[PDB]
Amino acid sequence: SMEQVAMELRLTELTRLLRSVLDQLQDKDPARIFAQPVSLKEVPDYLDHIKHPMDFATMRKRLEAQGYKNLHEFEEDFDLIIDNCMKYNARDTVFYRAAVRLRDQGGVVLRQARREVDSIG
Predict the structure, then answer these.
(1) 52: Cβ contacts below 8 Å, ≥ 6 apart
(2) Contact 87, 53 (CB under 8 A)
(3) Rounded to whole angstroms, how far apart are CA atoms 89 and 97?
(4) What is the per-residue DSSP string for 12-74?
(5) What is the CA radius of gyration of the chain?
(6) Is 62 within 8 Å of 68 (Cβ atoms)?
(7) Are 22 and 55 spatial neighbours (Cβ–Cβ below 8 Å)?
(8) Can you list the domains of the chain with their CATH numbers?
């Protein structure tokens, strides 16, 4: 049906809009602390601590597989990255300070991103 084609043209354009946003969020991690999943080789106990790991490359596989149905699903993955980090790592660490910074700065990008989704449907 053509009515499925209109759905896919609107998913494509969410997916293209989320592409921008992820790039903007990931520029706020210039150290690349969050670029890749935490290495299970290097941190074998990691899943004892964190049950739903998340990082930027993983969010990007799922973005180019058109796997984010709405903005809320995208925003959840982003908050996982931040929240896992702030549990796993102590307050006086480069890692925890980098998540605090990314949260704070990402809040601006996400607060405009909400409005553009609502605006353009």
Answers:
(1) 80, 84
(2) no
(3) 9
(4) HHHHHHHHHHHHHHHHT-TT-TTSSPPPTTT-TTHHHH-SS---HHHHHHHHHTT---SHHHH
(5) 16
(6) yes
(7) no
(8) 1-121 (1.20.920.10)
